[PDB]
Design a protein around this nucleic acid. Structure first.
Ligand SMILES: [K+]
Ligand SMILES: [K+]
Ligand SMILES: [Mn+2]
Ligand SMILES: [Mn+2]
Ligand SMILES: [Mn+2]
Ligand SMILES: [Mn+2]
Length: 135
RNA sequence: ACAU
DNA sequence: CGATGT
């Protein structure tokens, strides 16, 4: 219905899919960039969307914030709920880094608790999520 | 189909 | 047009 402005919005950006992946989190109200991950040479859109949510969970937990997280990724929201990122990306030498980060994100989810609501950003009604890369 |  | 996912 309405945008919860008191929230964190996250998104992936990429050069190719699979390709170079990065992500960031922004204050939904102001657009202030709160975190940005250094580009990862090969990953998928969904792996990056997943890492962005998990990073958001960790960022908010560390700061004792109860804000929700918005993501525009149906897939990544489900992977976080399941604590399991069901990516199809080949596990090989060139994908080792993204897969390490994904495995470590799952590991964090499996060893920590959170109440953070993870909400679908309704692009069809609200436009692009505020963390979008404009590309 | 829906979401990226 | 191609891709990643449920
Ligand atoms: K989108
Ligand atoms: K498809
Ligand atoms: Mn997105
Ligand atoms: Mn794993
Ligand atoms: Mn985007
Ligand atoms: Mn885009």
């Amino acid at each position: 219905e309405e945008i919860i402005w008191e929230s964190l919005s996250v998104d992936v950006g990429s050069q190719g899919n699979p390709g170079i992946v990065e992500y960031k989190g922004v204050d939904t109200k102001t657009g202030e960039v709160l975190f940005e991950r250094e580009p990862i040479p090969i990953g998928t859109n969904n792996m990056g969307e997943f890492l962005a949510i998990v990073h958001g969970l960790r960022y908010l937990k560390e700061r004792n914030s109860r804000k929700p997280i918005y993501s525009d990724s149906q897939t990544a929201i489900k992977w976080v709920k399941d604590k399991k990122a069901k990516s199809t990306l080949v596990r090989n030498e060139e994908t080792a880094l993204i897969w390490k980060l994904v495995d470590e994100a799952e590991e964090w989810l499996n060893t920590h608790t959170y109440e953070t609501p993870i909400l679908k950003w309704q692009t069809d009604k609200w436009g692009e999520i505020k963390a979008d890369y404009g590309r």
